[PDB]
Amino acid sequence: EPFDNTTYKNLQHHDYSTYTFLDLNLDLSKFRMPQPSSGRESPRH
Amino acid sequence: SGVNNTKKWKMEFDTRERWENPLMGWASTADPLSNLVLTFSTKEDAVAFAEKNGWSYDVEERKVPKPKSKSYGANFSWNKRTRVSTK
């Protein structure tokens, strides 16, 4: 609660590793909305 | 892609024998009309010339390229096959 403007509070990112970003994306998938569909599996289909 | 040699009508004659010169191997001919080409503005002009000169002729109608529908935005279509996979 003290307005201590003398410390760097962004220290979490010093523990991230090789798969931090893609692990978060995996957890986030349960939240996303259903994706829209163009209608075909690919432009080549 | 230039199209400036497809503007005018031409009249040429049937191809006749060429053979190998015994001495040097050059292409010999006995056809006096082998290199003869005439240029006209219209088919009716070309035909009239052949008629008065007594030559039989087979006319071929001009081949004009068809108009195409070009769209640069179609290269990134959302649900169509016209989407390109590379630029």
Mutate to test the interface with B, among A35, A37, A38, A45 (most CBs of B within 10 A): A38
| B50 sits in which H/E element | helix B43-52
CB B83 within 8 A of CB B77: yes
Structure tokens at B58: 């087979």
φ and ψ at B38, to 5 degrees?
A: -120, 150
C-beta separation of B20 from B28 below 8 A: yes
Question: Which residues in chain A touch residue B81, judged by CB atoms under 8 angstroms apart?
Answer: 43-44
Residues of B whose CB is below 8 A from A44: 81
Answer whether B79 sits within 8 Å of A44, measured CB to CB. no
